[PDB]
Design a protein around this ligand. Structure first.
Ligand SMILES: N[C@@H](Cn1cc(F)c(=O)[nH]c1=O)C(=O)O
Ligand SMILES: N[C@@H](Cn1cc(F)c(=O)[nH]c1=O)C(=O)O
Ligand SMILES: [Zn+2]
Ligand SMILES: [Zn+2]
Lengths: 258, 258
């Protein structure tokens, strides 16, 4: 009866409230996805419990062990009824889970430290003085592993074999490494996170270029779940009433410290 | 065995080839959607026949007669197996047909004649000297009919009752009326068309402002069609290989005459 909503700690989507550690259940969290889960549950009329995924990963299938980890895995093996998160709608995932139409548009972007002499993906691919990496084990990393485009083929070639590891267990680790690297590390991350950080102190980073691709986040359910339909109509409705567009403004630009 | 693909005459999506009238079948057409239909059929492995919808409408349900017209209607009553077109993924439609994940992102934008003193939706709503309208009987018109947002409520109020009719049987009629109106008519149309025109002679129009909303075009099939799944995976695949992104460039920016 109570729906398990799997989710991940990623700002500004799901974040601990100023005084969690002092609260319980869904009270402990806040963010875009928290508000979104709340809206969806209201229109779908369910009680739900937010659960932060254990391994803190998004979802990939190990090639040797064939097992799905992360949020996707929680759905695939039934431990979660629905994931509300910045979960990218990719082809491999859609074969094993279900996705609503996107609730947010985005694309892979480049985040530099202010004053870095990089404007584009080519600017980065045609040099070695500035290191650059991506979040680990996610759709951004995969974008490059798979690309058949010259420049992205160049980039994946550099990153795939870079010492130390240019990937990062987390978004914050990439951001941190951009801030601490005196303009000698560009981070490749999804435009939405990039845009969020750009409005946070010490306001020393910035989005350069246009996006490398296009894609969306979907609310995801297990393949064949009875919840799939209501959930999709719910997201579309929130879209049509401007809600998503009201929620984006709130967590990105009103929280803006610059 | 041969799949009927319903479609509409809308540039640059589906357009007559320089010397149709002299050709037959799918040969008569070209455009983004023609290339897209072709790609999809290749991965789904079907022979198909392109059909331009009779009434030249997108799809709405008459309130008195309860009947669906346009491309949607062709799917709903089985005369078409799949629509490949600039068909907006809206809530009311998704209740009766099926939609792939979006193959293109867009939003309602404002198209002025160069030099018009309008930058935004508020700029337009706070005056009466410049008329402004929308395509008729489509999701853009509906966006305003439904909006609960002050400024859009103002705008729909003006348009709903404007003499002569500010709506337009067609995109081209709106564009034409913008070009012939000496900066006394702004056209409200989807960003993608707006962007296309902006790069066409006599290059006397331009997109002003940001978009009023967000949404996508989906490839649509009848509700429950066995084709729904293959089609969705196909669109996602084309996305991941950069195809859609190769096709956008081709019909928008390489055809560019400015
Ligand atoms: N949403 C992603 C995960 N994810 C998040 C990021 F912020 C990012 O830069 N890259 C990435 O893959 C996908 O679902 O794996
Ligand atoms: N794609 C639309 C139709 N459509 C097209 C336009 F170019 C436009 O400006 N407005 C609109 O509603 C929907 O599916 O009705
Ligand atoms: Zn804490
Ligand atoms: Zn002709």
């Amino acid at each position: 009866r109570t729906i398990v909503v799997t989710t991940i700690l990623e700002s500004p989507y799901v974040m601990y409230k100023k005084n969690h550690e002092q609260l319980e259940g869904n009270e402990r969290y806040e963010g875009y996805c928290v508000d979104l889960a709340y809206e969806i549950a209201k229109h779908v009329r369910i009680k739900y419990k937010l659960s932060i995924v254990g391994d803190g990963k998004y979802g990939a299938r190990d090639p040797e062990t064939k097992i799905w980890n992360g949020m996707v895995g929680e759905l695939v093996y039934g431990r979660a009824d629905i994931a509300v998160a910045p979960l990218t709608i990719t082809l491999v995932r859609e074969e094993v889970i279900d996705f609503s139409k996107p609730f947010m548009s985005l694309g892979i972007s480049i985040m530099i430290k202010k004053g870095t002499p990089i404007e584009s993906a080519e600017d980065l691919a045609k040099q070695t003085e500035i290191a650059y990496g991506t979040l680990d084990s996610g759709s951004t990393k995969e974008f490059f592993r798979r690309s058949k485009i010259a420049v992205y083929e160049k980039m994946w070639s550099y990153m795939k074999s870079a010492e130390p590891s240019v990937f990062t267990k987390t978004t914050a680790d990439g951001v941190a490494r951009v801030r601490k690297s005196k303009g000698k590390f560009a981070f490749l991350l999804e435009s939405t996170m990039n845009e969020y950080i750009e409005q946070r102190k010490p306001c020393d980073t910035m989005k350069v270029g246009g996006n490398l691709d296009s894609k969306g986040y979907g609310v995801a359910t297990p393949k064949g779940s009875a919840l799939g339909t209501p959930v999709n109509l719910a997201v579309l409705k929130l879209s049509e009433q401007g809600i998503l567009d009201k929620l984006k403004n709130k967590w990105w630009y009103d929280k803006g410290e610059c």
